[PDB]
Amino acid sequence: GSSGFRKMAFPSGKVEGCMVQVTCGTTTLNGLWLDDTVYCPRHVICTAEDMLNPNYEDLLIRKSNHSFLVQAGNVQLRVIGHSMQNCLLRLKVDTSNPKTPKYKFVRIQPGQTFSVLACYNGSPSGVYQCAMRPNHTIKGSFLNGSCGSVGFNIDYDCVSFCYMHHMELPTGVHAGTDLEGKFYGPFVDRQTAQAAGTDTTITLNVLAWLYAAVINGDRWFLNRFTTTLNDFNLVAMKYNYEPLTQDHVDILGPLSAQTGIAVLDMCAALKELLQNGMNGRTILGSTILEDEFTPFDVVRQCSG
Amino acid sequence: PLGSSGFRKMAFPSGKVEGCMVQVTCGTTTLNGLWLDDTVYCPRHVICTAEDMLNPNYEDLLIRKSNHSFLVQAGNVQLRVIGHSMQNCLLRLKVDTSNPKTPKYKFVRIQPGQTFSVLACYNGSPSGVYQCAMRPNHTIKGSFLNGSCGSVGFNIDYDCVSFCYMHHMELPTGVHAGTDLEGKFYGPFVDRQTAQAAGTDTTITLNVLAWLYAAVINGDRWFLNRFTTTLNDFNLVAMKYNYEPLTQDHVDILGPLSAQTGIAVLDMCAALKELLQNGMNGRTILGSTILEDEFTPFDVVRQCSGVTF
Ligand SMILES: */C(=C\C(=O)OCC)[C@H](C[C@@H]1CCNC1=O)NC(=O)[C@H](CC(C)C)NC(=O)[C@@H](NC(=O)[C@@H](NC(=O)c1ccoc1)C(C)C)C(C)C
Ligand SMILES: */C(=C\C(=O)OCC)[C@H](C[C@@H]1CCNC1=O)NC(=O)[C@H](CC(C)C)NC(=O)[C@@H](NC(=O)[C@@H](NC(=O)c1ccoc1)C(C)C)C(C)C
Numbered sequence: 001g002s003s004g005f006r007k008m009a010f011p012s013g014k015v016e017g018c019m020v021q022v023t024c025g026t027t028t029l030n031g032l033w034l035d036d037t038v039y040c041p042r043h044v045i046c047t048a049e050d051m052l053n054p055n056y057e058d059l060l061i062r063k064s065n066h067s068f069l070v071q072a073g074n075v076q077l078r079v080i081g082h083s084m085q086n087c088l089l090r091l092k093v094d095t096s097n098p099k100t101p102k103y104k105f106v107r108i109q110p111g112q113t114f115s116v117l118a119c120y121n122g123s124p125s126g127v128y129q130c131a132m133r134p135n136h137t138i139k140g141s142f143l144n145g146s147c148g149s150v151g152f153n154i155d156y157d158c159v160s161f162c163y164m165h166h167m168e169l170p171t172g173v174h175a176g177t178d179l180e181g182k183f184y185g186p187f188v189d190r191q192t193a194q195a196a197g198t199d200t201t202i203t204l205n206v207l208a209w210l211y212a213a214v215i216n217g218d219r220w221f222l223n224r225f226t227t228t229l230n231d232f233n234l235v236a237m238k239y240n241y242e243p244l245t246q247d248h249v250d251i252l253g254p255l256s257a258q259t260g261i262a263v264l265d266m267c268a269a270l271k272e273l274l275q276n277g278m279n280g281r282t283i284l285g286s287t288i289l290e291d292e293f294t295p296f297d298v299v300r301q302c303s304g
Numbered sequence: 305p306l307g308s309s310g311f312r313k314m315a316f317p318s319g320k321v322e323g324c325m326v327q328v329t330c331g332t333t334t335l336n337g338l339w340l341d342d343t344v345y346c347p348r349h350v351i352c353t354a355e356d357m358l359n360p361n362y363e364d365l366l367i368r369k370s371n372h373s374f375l376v377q378a379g380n381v382q383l384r385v386i387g388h389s390m391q392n393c394l395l396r397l398k399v400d401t402s403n404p405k406t407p408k409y410k411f412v413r414i415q416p417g418q419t420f421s422v423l424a425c426y427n428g429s430p431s432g433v434y435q436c437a438m439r440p441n442h443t444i445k446g447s448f449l450n451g452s453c454g455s456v457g458f459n460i461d462y463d464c465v466s467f468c469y470m471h472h473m474e475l476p477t478g479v480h481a482g483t484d485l486e487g488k489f490y491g492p493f494v495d496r497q498t499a500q501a502a503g504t505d506t507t508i509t510l511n512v513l514a515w516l517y518a519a520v521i522n523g524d525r526w527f528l529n530r531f532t533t534t535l536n537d538f539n540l541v542a543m544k545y546n547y548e549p550l551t552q553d554h555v556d557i558l559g560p561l562s563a564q565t566g567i568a569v570l571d572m573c574a575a576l577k578e579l580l581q582n583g584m585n586g587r588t589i590l591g592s593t594i595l596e597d598e599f600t601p602f603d604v605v606r607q608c609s610g611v612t613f
Contacts, residue, residue, distance in 0.1 A: 002478035006447040008432035011423060013319030117317065123612035126314035127433060139591075141312040143305055143610045172308035216478070285445070287594050301432070301447055 002216045003302050005284045007292060009115035009129035010154040015161075017099030020077065021122030022091070022148065023069040030119045030148025031070060031091070032161070032179075034100050038070050038077070038091040039179060040148045041166050042084055043189050051191045060084055065091075071122065072097075086181025087189050088164065103159040105179035110134045111202045111242070113294050114151040114162050118142065131292040134242055135199040136185030137173040138163070151176075169196060201291050203242040204251065207266055208295040211255040213284045215302045221283060222261070225268040232267040239274045251295050258303070306608065310591035311518055311599065313435040314607055315421040316460045323405030326383065327428030328397070328454065329375040336425040336454030337376060337397070338470070338485075341406050344376055344383070344397040345485060346454045347472050348390055349495055357497045366390055377428060378403075392487025393495050394470065407465050411485035414468040416440050417508045417548070419600050420457040422469070427451060437598040438469075440548055441505040442491025443479040446471070457482070460613045475502050506548040508597040510557060513550075513572055515596045517561040518604040519589045527589065528567070531574045538573040545580050561601055 022031035022040045025047055031040035043051070045059050045067075065079040068091055081092035108114060113131045117124055118141070130138055130151075142149070142165060151163030166176045166189055173196065175187045187194055210221065233243050249263040256263050270289075278287060293301075328337040328346045331353060337346040349357065351365050351373075369388070374397055376383040387398030414420060419437045423430050424447065436444045436457065448455070448471060457469025471482045472495050479502055481493040493500055519525070539549045555569045562569050576595075584593065605611070 001474055001476070003449050004445060004447040004474075004478060004480065006434040006436075006445075007313065008424065008434035008447060009315060011318045011322050011430040011433050013317075013322040013430070016317050016319040118314070118610075120610050120612050124317035124319070125610055125612045126607070127317055128312040128314045130312070139307070139309050141306045141310065141314070141607060145610070168307055174307055302449075304426070304449055 005212055005216060005301065007129050008301065009127045010152065012115065012117045012124065012127040014101040014154065014159050015117045015150065015152055016124045017101070018097060019117070019119050019122050019124060021071045023071075024063070024067055028121065029145065030122055032148070032150055032164070033070075033072065033077075033093070033097045034103060036093055036096045038079075038093055039164065040089055040091070041164065041189070042087050042089045042181070043147070043166070044089065053192075054190055056084065060089075084181075087166065087177050087183060088179070088181035101159050102157055103161060106153075106160045106162050107178040107180070107182070107184075108132055108162045110136055110184075111204060111294070113292060113297055114153050116140060116151045116163070116165075117149060118146055119149045120145045129292065131202060131205065131294075132163075132184060133173075133199050134202060135197045136187075137169065137175055137196045137199070140165075140174045142168065142174055150179075169194065171196070198240075200240050200242045201289070203236060203244045203291075204248045204295065205291040205293055206241075206289045207244075207248075207252060207263070207270060208255060208298045209284070209290045209293045210266055210270060211252070211259055211261070211295075212293065212298040212302055214259045214261060215255075215298075216284065218283065220281065221273055221278075222265070222269050223272055225272070226262070226265050227268040227271055229264070229267075232264070232271055235271050235274060241274070254299060255295055306522055308523060311515070311522070311596070311607065313598065314603075315433045315435045316458070317613055318421065318423050318430065318433045320407040320460070320465050321423050321456065321458055322430045323407070324403060325423070325425050325428055325430055327377045329377075330369065330373055334427065335451065336428055338454070338456055338467070339378065339383070339399070339403045339406075340409060342399055342402045344385075344399055345470065346395050346397070347470065347495070348393050348395050348487070349453070349472070350395065359496045359498060362390065366395075393472065393483050393489060394485075394487035408463055409465040409467060412459075412466045412468050413484040413486075413488070414438050414457075414490070416442065417510055417600070419598060419603055420459050420468050422446055422457045422471075423455060424448065424452060425455040435598065435603075437508065437511065437600075438490060439479070439505050440508065441503040442493075443475060443481055443502045443505075444469075446480045448474065448480060463613070475500060477502055506546055507595075509542060509548045509550045510554045511597040511600055512547070512595045513554075513558055513569065513576060514561060514601040514604050515590070515599045516572055516576060517558070517565055517567070517601075518599065518608060520565050520567065521604070521608050522590060524590055526587065527579055527584075528571075528575050529578060532568065532571045533574040533577055535570065535573075538570070538577055541577050541580060547580075558601055561604060
């Protein structure tokens, strides 16, 4: 029967065990403690007067290991070393985190999804799933004090960290870096006017989602038409949708085979949906075309 | 404050519950169990075989089982069962080892409309976490596959994990049914594969109002007006849109949010009233085109204030 369909995140336990608090001056934010290293946003070393045009090289050289206070719960972890890697600081501590899970650092591609463990003062608040926007921003829910929180994916027992939160744009969206400290998107960590490129809807994901609805027993939006890749794009682009490529249709191969619905035939269905709307109906409980589920997310939730 | 663009359906951090999940096998039937101190809780149908699910006689099936009939595994280690008993629709297996990861906890029976986080599990291993609401018709719209029974629902009340749900089955309409941690089903359902149907469901009015307050808190207040309504007049309109009747008790539950925004509950009802009769006119609330009903007054305070655990 139907499996049901929820926007689910990965269990956050393996990440919770790595969260700590990092303070420098009067600024306190979150850090990630793996083995004997603690990672956090480099702006932790900024003072109110340094946020407009900071020179992190100059601000950091003025610091020592003891300028940093890291705390795991109520216990202080002594910093015995420090270095800056792009927009992150790597603080070495004198004790290893026994809760460090198997892990790796990965830089995800726009359109891919991940789980965010929102934290404050080194303590977990909640977890939610989201997708990195085509324009590299994240439509997240973050309050002041949330910097340092991380995004991740879990494959079996291995945690793949892919994001660390740094800031909020004038438009209300969020931006951050991978665990190597490199920003996602054309952004810099300073309080200046910065804008993201034009965003688009993740076409691959909307299609994967339409397949999820079908494997779950719903087919009302299908039709007897088909389309070429080119003709589909001429329409989709009018609605601010990401151009679809042959690689994307190949990625949908498995889902296509499981449902018996050709990728291009599903594109024809999407084409009709964009042109006529849903006429008051819903798909998997939604009144809008959902784009935060990748083909992989669908196969894992609807078929293990 | 949150990033002015969408209220995420945030689940509670799941670590404390992940440390309580184990695998329970009886014969060829394997599912999930909850290990707290020296007891492992699981659905009683674990003692059932393929064809013995239409109308199993649990009391009699259990008689044929001994402690050795149960194989419990925490990770790659076997947990020796030294006792077993049935409590309503659950089994309580006593083991010779107290869970070193047992967190402070309590068992609570959730009420209609209230939400909780579900930790989907398979073979004793956590797979995902998501937020769910106990629908007015006593079912939940979850996401479960075979091997998922035994997975649990919970809330974290400060420093205490409050377990409120254990998964048992799926209904023909694609929704789910389960029990509290005392083994008592929510709703009139029973754990046997017979003809069972959930009643017609309604929109959780209390939650929709809570969500509108969250909108205001976030700065999305275009839908507010200078009027008010009577409880009776609101219900006359809302029930037309299949909304659950609003009660004075519900008004009181919204008290903290009403105080935070200075907007009287009936004044918010007036706004909701207009939204239902006039629609949103293409506008959005908290980045949504529809009125969300799976966020409770508590979920709102939790996300807006950034409560931690
Ligand atoms: C994490 C900080 C933390 O935990 O501090 C503990 C002491 C925060 C997280 C944000 C707060 C609100 N939402 C968030 O996600 N990060 C920051 O405060 C950064 C710090 C900078 C990079 C050193 N700053 C911001 O997010 C500020 N943004 C901006 O200044 C942006 N500019 C616009 O809003 C603007 C108006 C005119 O020019 C720009 C900027 C593009 C990055 C926001 C306003 C706090
Ligand atoms: C958990 C079982 C498990 O983990 O087994 C390990 C060996 C499952 C969970 C469901 C699988 C799919 N989604 C789920 O949530 N629970 C069950 O298999 C129960 C077991 C019964 C209570 C002993 N059975 C079901 O969920 C079956 N449901 C039904 O048979 C329902 N009836 C309708 O479909 C119906 C009405 C008239 O004929 C059928 C029944 C009302 C409970 C589902 C189909 C497997």
